[PDB]
Write a protein that binds this ligand. Structure first.
Ligand SMILES: CCCCCCCCCCCCCCCC(=O)O
Ligand SMILES: [Cl-]
Ligand SMILES: [Cl-]
Length: 174
């Protein structure tokens, strides 16, 4: 009976790009089809004077045949009418790395502790998402405090994803 229509999902009110800048460690991920970033995922968010948000990311990716590489990715965000919803153009510093353009929603954050991100790449005909991914980010690479963990779990459930996350390990591979 819970609403899993993407159009129903709440996102961060009055999202503040400047407060969001800096280092975010991925603690958990819900994978999309043909997943790219595997683990050791660390993102760096910036804003320029124009107010344009951008980011970089490091992480182990596993090209099939069991070949691991540390991908180095770049993203630039185009604003929409909702301050928490963006279009993210992304590519790798190496051109053979995956490129594309995904929706990028900041579903919730408190800026200094946790963030929950969401992207629906493709809708179902009933408004639910056919192909989604989601990152949970922490400022501390050792994980979230209990109060933040509990908030995040609630958001995960609201996105209809709470059963579908896996933990992201950080072991200095990159
Ligand atoms: C959304 C993650 C951090 C945002 C920074 C964007 C920098 C480019 C990272 C590309 C993410 C594309 C891969 C996401 C889906 C996946 O990993 O399977
Ligand atoms: Cl709990
Ligand atoms: Cl669960």
């Amino acid at each position: 009976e819970r609403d899993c229509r993407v159009s129903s999902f709440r996102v961060k009110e009055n999202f503040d790009k400047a407060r969001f800048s800096g280092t975010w460690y991925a603690m958990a991920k819900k994978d999309p089809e043909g997943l790219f970033l595997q683990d050791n995922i660390v993102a760096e968010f910036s804003v320029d004077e124009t107010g344009q948000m951008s980011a970089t990311a490091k992480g182990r990716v596993r090209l099939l045949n069991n070949w691991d590489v540390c991908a180095d990715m770049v993203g630039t965000f185009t604003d929409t009418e909702d301050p928490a919803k963006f279009k993210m153009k992304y590519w790798g510093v190496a051109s053979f790395l995956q490129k594309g353009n995904d929706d990028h929603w900041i579903v919730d954050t408190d800026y200094d502790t946790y963030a929950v991100q969401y992207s629906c790449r493709l809708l179902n005909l009933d408004g639910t998402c056919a192909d989604s991914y989601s990152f949970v980010f922490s400022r501390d690479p050792n994980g979230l405090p209990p109060e933040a963990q509990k908030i995040v779990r609630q958001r995960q459930e609201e996105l209809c994803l709470a059963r579908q996350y896996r933990l992201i390990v950080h072991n200095g591979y990159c």
